[PDB]
Amino acid sequence: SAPANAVAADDATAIALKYNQDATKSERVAAARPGLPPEEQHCANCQFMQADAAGATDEWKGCQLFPGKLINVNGWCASWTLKAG
Amino acid sequence: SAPANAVAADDATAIALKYNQDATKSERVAAARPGLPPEEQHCANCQFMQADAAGATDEWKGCQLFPGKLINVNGWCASWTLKAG
Ligand code: SF4
Ligand code: SF4
């Protein structure tokens, strides 16, 4: 089961930022954010994902943009940015 | 007159996010978002602010949560998080 502090689907920030815990159901094709084809975009390779968040698991990680919460590594939002060198 | 796409108080996203174009009149103290003293928080030091948005001025700048629109640099909403990276 999801952590209790998972980002909720209809959290107001999640709504505004176009977060979806399943990237395949997200607006990523429409958004056309640069750096990878949309089909390759998800939280796991994002700049803002925080691997060392409290309560992180292989599936659930922090995000700079959702303080105190956990996103799904297979998620996406409109701030997706490939983590660069 | 302000940019045509300045965020209005009756914008539906604004209401959901608890945006106020005057941070001093916002809920920022009670909300106590982490990362800076709440009384110092406003759009100008927020991670979501986009200073190079089309139509921006020294007063009106972009926000990732209000695509296509301009917030006030002195504003605040409950999604505030410190600009960082
Ligand atoms: S900023 Fe990155 S890690 Fe955070 S929810 Fe959006 S895509 Fe996922
Ligand atoms: S997310 Fe940040 S920049 Fe956007 S309205 Fe809220 S406080 Fe202002």
B60 lines ligand 2 (CB under 6 A): no
Candidate from A12, A17, A47 with C-beta closest to B64 = A17
Helix or strand holding residue B62 (H, E): strand B60-63
Say what the alpha-carbon torsion angle A64, B36, B66, B13 is, to the nearest 10 degrees.
100
Q: What does DSSP assign to residue B72?
A: E
Rounded to an integer, what distance in angstroms lies between the CA atom of residue B59 and that of residue B73? Answer: 5
Instruction: Report how many domains make up chain B.
Output: 1
Angle at A8 between CA A68 and CA B75, to 5 degrees: 65
Rounded to an integer, what distance in angstroms lies between the CA atom of residue B24 and that of residue A29? Answer: 39
Instruction: Tell me the CATH number at A25.
Output: 4.10.490.10
β-bridge mates for residue A61, sequence order: A71
Residue among A77, A60, A59 at smallest CA distance from A69: A60
Q: Find the domain containing B36 and state its range.
A: 1-85
Q: What does DSSP assign to residue A8?
A: P
Sheet containing strand A49-50, strands side by side: A49-50, A60-63, A71-72
**PDB experimental method:** X-ray
By the 8 A CB rule, do B47 and A65 touch? yes
Enter the resolution in angstroms.
Answer: 1.2
| Minimum CA–CA partner of B81 in chain A | A65
